[PDB]
Amino acid sequence: SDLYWKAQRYRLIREFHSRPALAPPFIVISHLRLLKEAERKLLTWESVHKENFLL
Amino acid sequence: EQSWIPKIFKKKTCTTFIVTLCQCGRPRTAHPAVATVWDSDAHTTEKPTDAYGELDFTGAGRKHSNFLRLSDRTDPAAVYSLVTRTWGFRAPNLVVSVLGGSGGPVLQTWLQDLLRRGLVRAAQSTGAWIVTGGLHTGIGRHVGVAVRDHQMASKVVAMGVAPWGVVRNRDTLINPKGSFPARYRWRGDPEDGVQFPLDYNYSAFFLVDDGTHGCLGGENRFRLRLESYISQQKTGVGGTGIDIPVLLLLIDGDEKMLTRIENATQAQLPCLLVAGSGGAADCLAETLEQGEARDRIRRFFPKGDLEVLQAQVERIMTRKELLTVYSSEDGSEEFETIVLKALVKACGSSEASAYLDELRLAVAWNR
Amino acid sequence: VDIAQSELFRGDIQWRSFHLEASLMDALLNDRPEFVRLLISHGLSLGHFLTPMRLAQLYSAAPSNSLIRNLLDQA
Ligand SMILES: Nc1ncnc2c1ncn2[C@@H]1O[C@H](COP(=O)(O)OP(=O)(O)OP(=O)(O)O)[C@@H](O)[C@H]1O
Numbered sequence A: 001s002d003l004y005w006k007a008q009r010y011r012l013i014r015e016f017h018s019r020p021a022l023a024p025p026f027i028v029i030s031h032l033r034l035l036k037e038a039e040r041k042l043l044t045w046e047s048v049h050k051e052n053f054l055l
Numbered sequence B: 001e002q003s004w005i006p007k008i009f010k011k012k013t014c015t016t017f018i019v020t021l022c023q024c025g026r027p028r029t030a031h032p033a034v035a036t037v038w039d040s041d042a043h044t045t046e047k048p049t050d051a052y053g054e055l056d057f058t059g060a061g062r063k064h065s066n067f068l069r070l071s072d073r074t075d076p077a078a079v080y081s082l083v084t085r086t087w088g089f090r091a092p093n094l095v096v097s098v099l100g101g102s103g104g105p106v107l108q109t110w111l112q113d114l115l116r117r118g119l120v121r122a123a124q125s126t127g128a129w130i131v132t133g134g135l136h137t138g139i140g141r142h143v144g145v146a147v148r149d150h151q152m153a154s155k156v157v158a159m160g161v162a163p164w165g166v167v168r169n170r171d172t173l174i175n176p177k178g179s180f181p182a183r184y185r186w187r188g189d190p191e192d193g194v195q196f197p198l199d200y201n202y203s204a205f206f207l208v209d210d211g212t213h214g215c216l217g218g219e220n221r222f223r224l225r226l227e228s229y230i231s232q233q234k235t236g237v238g239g240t241g242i243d244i245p246v247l248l249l250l251i252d253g254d255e256k257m258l259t260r261i262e263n264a265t266q267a268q269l270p271c272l273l274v275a276g277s278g279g280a281a282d283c284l285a286e287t288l289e290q291g292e293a294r295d296r297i298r299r300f301f302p303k304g305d306l307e308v309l310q311a312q313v314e315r316i317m318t319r320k321e322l323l324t325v326y327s328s329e330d331g332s333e334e335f336e337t338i339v340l341k342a343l344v345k346a347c348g349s350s351e352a353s354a355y356l357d358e359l360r361l362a363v364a365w366n367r
Numbered sequence C: 001v002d003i004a005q006s007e008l009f010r011g012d013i014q015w016r017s018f019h020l021e022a023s024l025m026d027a028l029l030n031d032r033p034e035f036v037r038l039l040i041s042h043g044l045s046l047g048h049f050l051t052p053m054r055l056a057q058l059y060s061a062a063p064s065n066s067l068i069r070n071l072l073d074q075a
């Protein structure tokens, strides 16, 4: 159960991350208002740690 | 501050013309009016350095890459003092040189892993200097890839030496007035044979000038001279420091590499040989572990039966104490122990004053 | 597999990518993890090796009426 909650914690955060800022009673206005080389460096960084981890 | 450099250093010129084609290796529209077997010094003209500067590679880079042109007949002390003093490079606790032709566009994956894992990390831990061909070709290219890869996973300084003639896009380098900044077409599309660009992994470059448009081996004499001088040099606080150890790493190659090691061995420079490197490297490893037979198979058939190679091997074995062989141990992936074992063996002393450098490395590495 | 490295890759014999290409294919089709590891370890240019035809061969090597075959058949 502890692991399951920790996993569901993400689903909660994502749900509220995209929710409009205003509260339900005032959410109406928000609805109305609604209507490269670094990556290569990063990947290399990942691989090095993987290689070290396996070794 | 750099105004001293042009006076101190000179760029050689072919000058005299020796037999369309020219033995001087610089067939131009017309050799000078002043202009047999062409000689490096007999048929050359020394002129003040006209290509010193700090390269700034186009696109991504550190915008800091010292580029200098110098004659082969130059004292290693001057360059070392300039590097240590002017460019601000710290005195190296260790300097390791890489040699070998490294035949083929790419090397074996395990060997590359050994290079990047062992050599680079060891140098980074102790802040050693890695000196290789200053060209994005062959062995030098592989080292640069290793250094680049290690840098991405973060520095390590790795100077480079290459003949001036073989360099590509030398126009941007040529600047008698000096080029504190400089744009280099390192992404040279035309792989025009001998002409090569400069790998941008290396922090500094030495363009050996010998009055040629491009040739191999011109930097060997200067290379060995610099290694010997550094080997006989103290780090920090002038002489109050300790000797800077030096090790030569050979990976495959040809008789030229065999000549280099023999000269290095005569120079009392410890050498290390990697098992499985290939021709010009496996033969010596076997000998440490008939001689004509190995030259036939271990070395290329051309000149393999020639006893000149066998004679060099005998001379090489004559001072086998200085050199040693790094057994891959089925890919050991660690060689700090091997390097230390080599240096202590090469010391051959007992005063314990010459072992401080080895001790420091032993401390720097966890061994 | 240990025998192959001990004998076939004792170092007394050179090797070529084309020499090992067939063996590699067999190991992949026969699920020989140790061998494929060993063959790749011997400096095999995998990128220059793999071909779309070879890739098709591998997928064709699915076991009998394996689930993957059903998906491939539907595809
Ligand atoms: N002096 C150099 N000359 C050429 N390539 C260099 C040099 N130093 C490092 N490199 C790297 O070596 C590789 C050269 O080959 P190439 O450019 O074809 O490969 P790449 O990384 O796939 O990039 P590209 O898109 O330019 O083809 C590149 O990664 C380039 O970044």
Ligand SMILES: [Ca+2]
Binding pocket: B243, B245, B347, B354, B355, B356, B357, B358
């Ligand atoms: Ca010493």
